[PDB]
RNA sequence: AAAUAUGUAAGAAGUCCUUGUUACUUAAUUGAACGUGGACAUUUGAAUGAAGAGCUUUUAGUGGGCCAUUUUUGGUAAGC
RNA sequence: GAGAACAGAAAUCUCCAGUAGAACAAAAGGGUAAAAGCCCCCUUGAUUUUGAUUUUCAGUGUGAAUACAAACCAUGAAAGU
RNA sequence: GGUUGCGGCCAUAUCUACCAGAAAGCACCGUUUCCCGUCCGAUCAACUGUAGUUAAGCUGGUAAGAGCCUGACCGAGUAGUGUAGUGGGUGACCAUACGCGAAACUCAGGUGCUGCAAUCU
């Protein structure tokens, strides 16, 4: 283009060129009642990569946002889940995990257990009386398009079940009937565990077996059937409730050799 | 006939600066405003809710109330032969703090410190500021800079 | 017609004086939610400093 | 050469400008749910002109976008109507092309004398794997110039395929 | 992007520390506002001046204006 | 701008560029780009009680706006509006 | 040092053209049974990380580049301007005295910095 165009061109913000952030959303999620002066406003960031899930609890300051807790889906093998990590059940578990982690970091994991017997209802964390109120976080689903059945509400359900107060409605969980405005808890409980994957496992074991062996390869390599998922996820929920803490990864090197290896590659000036 | 509106004679006042158009950045929605704070009013025409009047642009005032998304400020307006307290509610987008007072505050944080220092030190230290006093004696050397004589230059051949 | 000549000399004979700020300004224009609780706070402080 | 560089077919759009709304327009749309299989989509007008005799927000014409294997089959059976003799003018600088036929029945479809005789407009678009980055929502971005489709790439692809015998005029 | 002109501040109704009230607020024994009780209280935190500061009532006349500098608008231009 | 039968300077379809050169009932000005615009969905905050404030200003009215409170409602996954 | 998520300042960060990217990551990519939305599983939705790839995106590099930022014995103490004079001049307008004092330009340099958490041979 010409020179005047490039002069009179105003750029957008960096995270709007990069296409990662909605400021029309951030302005509403972050700003607080001025009468609540320094009171932070905690967001529950849920993000989905092609082979991971990131749950984060984030407050905001002027020196960038700040994290309180984190829960990725590439650590669930601690608790049992190994396959199907970008999955509705994985999202549920990850939400439960960030919940159970945050609440013991604070001191409320014994006061707000949430739910432990899961049957798939719309149930909010009700505040105990003469006691601390629940931890209140607000969901911010990036640029993820909201659709009933989406994964991102898996984590929402998991968190509200895990103990902390995420205000929501049940019209975007799977098993919601548009014509009658009615929810199907049997279907939702089937989705919390692997129901919608187990039926496909069973339906391909009589329809397309080469494709079954192609997709569900690791399951057979680890000797898994379509019935053990409802055992695995429930055995993992209890484990998360047991030890939700963050024991980090033992590092091979010490962030100095990691830089010594990369410093020879980056084509320095 | 002539017009006296709420936004008359505001062509250049409430317009955005060059290459500063668009959304309001977030650092202003995260700044915190307490009663007693001192704020300078500068509006933006991106946000027509909570606008001040063109009189109060560039003025400076004191907060007296804090509400959701907006604060109240007191401003002394000259009308006739007296000043009047004008209490006006504004969204935060038309508000920035005043560093005028903050400089005084850190000057106090310094004078207290060196007063505390000098007391235990048994010395006296002057904390009243002073203007630019006159200069003082000095001696100017002529070693590398001999006085370079000049002259008024002529006009012919300059034109 | 609308000559401002002499009006500022008129304004400046009896000065232009400031509005005499006071301590404890009025609590009419403030958030009533705050005001309602302020009343109770001060009443309790009184009933406590009376006892001690 | 390499994978992830091949000029696969993205989609094929069929257009039919009927010009006027009515049973003619429904005749036009009736062929498409049997040719492609998908229902069509009618296209409202945009302005008001009387040389052609239309006004705004009239459903004057129709189209349909077909993808997948069926697109390449339809293209194969549509090219034999042109005898696989395309020009270089029809090819566009973006790396895509199309052609307009006069008779619709020369493709393999059953004939009726009541439906009418109306032509069609084929237009393909073909792009390498990796153009999602212009269409997605999060982290949009343009492809690199070493990865864009060009006229000289697609005419080469078309000479290779189908035994074109293009008319470089 | 000037010059001139313009808003605010330059401390005692202040600064620091501690812990009391509330039906507001907080995930909360979190803050907000008001406080108690202690510390600084010398140069009380720029200059010049202050011919006293603040407040209140009540009431007269006036509500035809002109000249000059400078800027400036219609007007050819004026003691327009 | 490059292209596609009838198709033309102009009917419909496709790609690239495009900081707004468009549109936002209506005057001009300001403002606005995952919107304040274009399409679609649900709705009636165009509601109740009465007050404080800004503007014209005598700090009176009328008119129009601003920000909260106590209620009831909508919308949305929610923040929020 | 590299990458991801959330971000702050929002061009030193943009635009144009060529090159390199080990590790992991991200991404591209594969599949439509279900939830879901499409003229079309293209976008969006869901499933698997399984079959393949760094080609692009992304990051880092380079350039008589445009653009942007920064600073000047640059322009320039210029233009303009406040105050004064029984100063000049027919007037336009000008000079002087006490003061304030630019800009476009010209020159030189630069071409994203950084915060929280996690992770990487």
């Amino acid at each position: 283009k010409s020179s005047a165009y490039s002069s009179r061109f105003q750029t957008p913000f960096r995270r709007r060129r990069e296409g990662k952030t909605d400021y029309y959303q951030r302005k509403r999620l972050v700003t607080q009642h001025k009468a609540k002066y320094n009171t932070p406003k905690y967001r529950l960031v849920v993000r989905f990569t092609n082979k991971d899930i990131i749950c984060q609890i984030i407050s905001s300051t002027i020196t960038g946002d700040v994290v309180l807790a984190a829960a990725y889906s590439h650590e669930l093998p601690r608790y049992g889940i190994t396959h199907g990590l970008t999955n509705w059940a994985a999202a549920y578990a990850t939400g439960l995990l960030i919940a159970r982690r945050t609440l013991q970091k604070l001191g409320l994991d014994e006061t707000y257990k949430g739910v432990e017997e899961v049957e798939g209802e719309y149930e909010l964390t009700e505040a105990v009386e003469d006691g601390p109120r629940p931890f209140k976080v607000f969901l911010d689903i990036g640029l993820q398009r909201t659709t009933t059945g989406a994964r991102v509400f898996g984590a929402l359900k998991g968190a509200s079940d895990g103990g902390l107060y995420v205000p929501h409605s049940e019209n975007r969980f799977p098993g919601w009937d548009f014509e009658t405005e009615e929810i199907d808890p049997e279907l939702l409980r089937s989705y919390i565990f692997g129901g919608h994957v187990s039926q496909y496992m069973e339906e391909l074991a009589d329809d397309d077996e080469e494709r079954f062996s192609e997709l569900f390869k690791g399951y057979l390599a680890d000797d898994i059937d379509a019935d053990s998922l409802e055992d695995i996820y429930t055995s993992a929920h209890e484990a998360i409730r047991a030890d939700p803490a963050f024991k980090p990864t033992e590092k091979k090197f010490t962030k100095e050799q990691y830089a010594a290896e990369s410093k020879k590659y980056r084509q320095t000036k | 006939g002539k017009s006296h509106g709420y936004r008359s004679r505001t062509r250049y006042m409430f317009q955005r600066d060059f290459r500063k158009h668009g959304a309001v950045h977030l650092s202003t929605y995260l700044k915190v405003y307490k009663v007693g704070d001192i704020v300078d009013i500068k509006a933006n025409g991106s946000i027509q809710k909570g606008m001040p009047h063109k009189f109060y642009q560039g003025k400076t005032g004191v907060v007296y109330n804090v509400t959701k998304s907006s604060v109240g400020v007191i401003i002394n307006k000259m009308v006739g032969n007296r000043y009047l307290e004008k209490r006006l509610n504004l969204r935060v987008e038309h508000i920035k703090h005043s560093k005028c007072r903050q400089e005084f505050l850190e000057r106090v944080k310094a004078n207290a410190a060196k007063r505390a220092e000098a007391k235990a030190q048994g010395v006296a230290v002057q904390l009243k500021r002073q203007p630019a006093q006159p200069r003082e004696s000095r001696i100017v050397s002529t070693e590398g800079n001999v006085p370079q004589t000049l002259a008024p230059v002529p006009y012919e051949t300059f034109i | 017609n609308h000559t401002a000549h002499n009006q500022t000399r008129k304004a400046h004979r009896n000065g232009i004086k400031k509005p005499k700020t006071y301590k404890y300004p009025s609590l009419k224009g403030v958030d009533p939610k705050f005001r309602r609780n302020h009343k109770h706070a001060l009443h309790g402080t009184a009933k406590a400093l009376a006892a001690a | 050469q390499n994978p992830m560089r091949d000029l696969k077919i993205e989609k094929l759009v069929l257009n039919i400008s009927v010009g006027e709304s009515g049973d003619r327009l429904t005749r036009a749309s009736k062929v498409l749910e049997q040719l492609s299989g998908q229902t069509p989509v009618q296209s409202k007008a945009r302005y008001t002109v009387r040389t052609f005799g239309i006004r705004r927000n009239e459903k004057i014409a129709v189209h349909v976008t077909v993808r997948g294997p069926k697109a390449e089959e339809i293209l194969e059976r549509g090219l034999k109507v042109k005898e696989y003799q395309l020009r270089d003018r029809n090819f566009s600088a973006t790396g895509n092309f199309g052609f307009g036929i006069d008779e619709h029945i020369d493709l393999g479809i059953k004939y009726d004398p009541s439906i009418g005789i109306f032509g069609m407009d084929f237009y393909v678009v073909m792009n390498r794997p990796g153009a999602r980055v212009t269409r997605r929502k999060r982290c949009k971005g343009t492809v690199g110039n070493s990865h864009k489709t060009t006229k000289e790439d697609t005419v080469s692809w078309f000479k290779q395929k189908y035994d074109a015998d293009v008319l470089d005029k």
Side-chain angles (χ1 to χ4, degrees), chain A residues 3 6 9 14-15 17 20-21 23 26 43 47 50-51 56 62 65 83-84 86-88 144 150-151 191 196 200 211 214-215 217 246 249 251 253 255 257-259 261-262 266-267 269:
Chain A
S3 179
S6 300
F9 186 76
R14 169 165 72 74
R15 286 186 77 72
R17 301 186 291 263
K20 286 180 168 84
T21 292
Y23 282 98
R26 203 184 148 70
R43 313 181 283 133
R47 295 283 180 284
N50 270 309
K51 40 168 72 176
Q56 284 161 303
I62 288 154
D65 280 13
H83 298 89
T86 306
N87 191 352
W88 211 93
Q144 174 59 29
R151 287 197 292 271
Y191 263 59
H196 67 294
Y200 196 36
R211 189 177 277 167
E214 176 158 29
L215 304 170
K217 209 168 76 179
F246 189 72
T249 70
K251 311 303 211 173
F253 321 118
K255 213 183 160 78
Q257 305 93 333
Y258 276 126
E261 203 194 54
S262 297
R266 59 178 165 100
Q267 207 172 24
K269 283 180 188 288

Side-chain angles (χ1 to χ4, degrees), chain D residues 68-78 162:
Chain D
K70 200 150 192 189
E72 181 171 1
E73 301 175 353
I74 289 163
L75 186 78
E76 261 184 346
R77 74 186 66 178
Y162 298 127

Side-chain angles (χ1 to χ4, degrees), chain D residues 6-17:
Chain D
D6 311 335
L7 288 76
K8 312 210 176 182
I9 307 300
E10 188 179 74
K11 62 187 180 211
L12 203 158
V13 70
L14 286 73
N15 194 29
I16 283 155
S17 162

Side-chain angles (χ1 to χ4, degrees), chain B:
Chain B
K2 205 174 154 170
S3 43
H4 313 263
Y6 202 82
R7 262 192 66 154
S8 63
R9 299 180 276 290
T10 62
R11 182 178 190 159
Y12 301 103
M13 178 178 276
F14 295 130
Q15 67 183 36
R16 313 303 297 288
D17 313 278
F18 198 59
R19 284 167 29 223
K20 318 293 184 275
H21 292 234
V24 164
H25 63 74
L26 268 287
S27 300
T28 192
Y29 297 119
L30 295 146
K31 293 237 189 198
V32 170
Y33 297 92
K34 288 163 83 202
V35 172
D37 280 355
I38 317 189
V39 310
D40 313 277
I41 288 152
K42 168 156 186 65
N44 51 350
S46 163
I47 311 296
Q48 306 93 347
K49 268 181 173 292
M51 292 192 91
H53 192 224
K54 70 209 194 215
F55 184 88
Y56 303 106
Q57 159 60 279
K59 309 288 180 271
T60 313
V62 161
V63 176
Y64 82 104
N65 186 33
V66 175
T67 49
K68 170 176 83 67
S69 87
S70 58
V71 306
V73 307
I74 294 163
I75 281 162
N76 295 338
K77 183 175 187 180
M78 189 263 262
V79 50
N81 64 317
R82 77 282 189 186
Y83 286 117
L84 294 177
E85 278 190 355
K86 297 302 230 179
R87 300 186 169 195
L88 56 95
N89 323 291
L90 307 156
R91 288 208 185 287
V92 172
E93 293 88 312
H94 319 280
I95 285 298
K96 180 73 191 216
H97 276 283
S98 190
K99 303 183 166 61
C100 68
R101 176 47 80 87
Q102 291 164 352
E103 190 274 352
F104 165 56
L105 295 176
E106 58 83 11
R107 181 164 69 79
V108 169
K109 169 154 65 187
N111 66 24
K114 72 184 77 159
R115 196 182 202 185
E117 207 279 325
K119 209 197 84 193
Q121 208 185 6
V123 310
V125 161
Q126 174 160 15
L127 278 301
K128 295 195 167 214
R129 297 174 292 166
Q130 297 286 257
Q133 293 267 324
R135 297 187 296 265
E136 196 50 61
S137 171
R138 53 179 73 104
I139 286 157
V140 173
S141 201
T142 294
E143 192 68 46
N145 45 1
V146 169
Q148 185 188 125
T149 185
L150 305 156
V153 293
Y155 193 73
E156 200 61 278
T157 322
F158 299 72
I159 268 57

Side-chain angles (χ1 to χ4, degrees), chain A residues 29 32 36 39-44 57-59 68 102-103 106 108 112 125 133-139 163-167:
Chain A
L29 286 156
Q32 214 191 26
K36 302 166 186 160
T39 303
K41 201 170 187 187
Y42 294 104
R43 313 181 283 133
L44 167 51
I57 299 283
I58 281 158
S59 178
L68 181 60
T102 314
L103 295 161
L106 303 193
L108 272 44
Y112 288 97
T125 282
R133 295 188 284 154
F135 195 67
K136 169 161 67 184
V137 310
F138 308 119
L139 198 80
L164 74 173
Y165 185 58
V166 194

